Paper text:
Here, we explore the precise structural inhibitory mechanism of actinonin, which is a slow, tight-binding inhibitor of peptide deformylase (PDF), a metal cation-dependent enzyme. PDF is the first enzyme in the N-terminal methionine excision pathway, an essential and ubiquitous process that contributes to the diversity of N-terminal amino acids. The function of the active-site metal is to activate the reactive water molecule involved in peptide hydrolysis. Actinonin is a natural product with antibiotic activity that inhibits PDF by mimicking the structure of its natural substrates (nascent peptide chains starting with Fo-Met-Aaa, where Fo is a formyl group and Aaa is any amino acid) in their transition state.
In the case of G41Q, the structure of the apo-protein did not show any modifications compared to the WT structure and remained in an O conformation (“O” zone). The 3D structure of the variants in the absence of ligand is similar to that of WT, and a strict correlation exists between the completeness of the conformational change and both binding potency and catalytic efficiency.
Numbering used by the authors: 1 to 181
Amino acid sequence: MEIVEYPDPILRAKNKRIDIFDENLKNLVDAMFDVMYKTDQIGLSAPQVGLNVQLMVFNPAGEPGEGKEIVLVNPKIKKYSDKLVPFDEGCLSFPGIYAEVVRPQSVKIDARDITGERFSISLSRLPARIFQHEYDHLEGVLFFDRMTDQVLDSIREELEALEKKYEEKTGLPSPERVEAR
Ligand SMILES: [Zn+2]
Ligand SMILES: [Zn+2]
Ligand SMILES: [Zn+2]
Ligand SMILES: [Zn+2]
Ligand SMILES: [Zn+2]
Ligand SMILES: [Zn+2]
């Protein structure tokens, strides 16, 4: 298993809905969770680990045996709150890169469980924050897309280094460039 980093093209690709809720969705949830736990994370999307589909493992507690293990197959945020707030956000795709981002405080979500049953849920504080961050992933959106132009200008060299890293490691031109912004 591996975490895909920017600027890898799977992180921006279209993520396919899931339909076969079977032994293999489960296995995949399991292994996505353990990655989430191995990287001290509170949530983690399928594109991040190389697969381009509509899947999220989550636990608000962000900790082994604390909170609840929730899976969100095909999530869709049905409500974002008017109040929004700052936070020094980070991402497993941009290691070491942290900058400020504004996202709505609380969110209303629908999704399907590991059995494919349809539930709802609301969140606030850090869990709605980590949930929005992983939700953008499912949508080919990376958190700097959500940064003002001054905040982004602050991490610009750290992104170009990643870009450069992907070019060196794959022999291909970077699929996208933060200069484009
Ligand atoms: Zn591996
Ligand atoms: Zn396991
Ligand atoms: Zn922790
Ligand atoms: Zn993540
Ligand atoms: Zn991320
Ligand atoms: Zn440049």
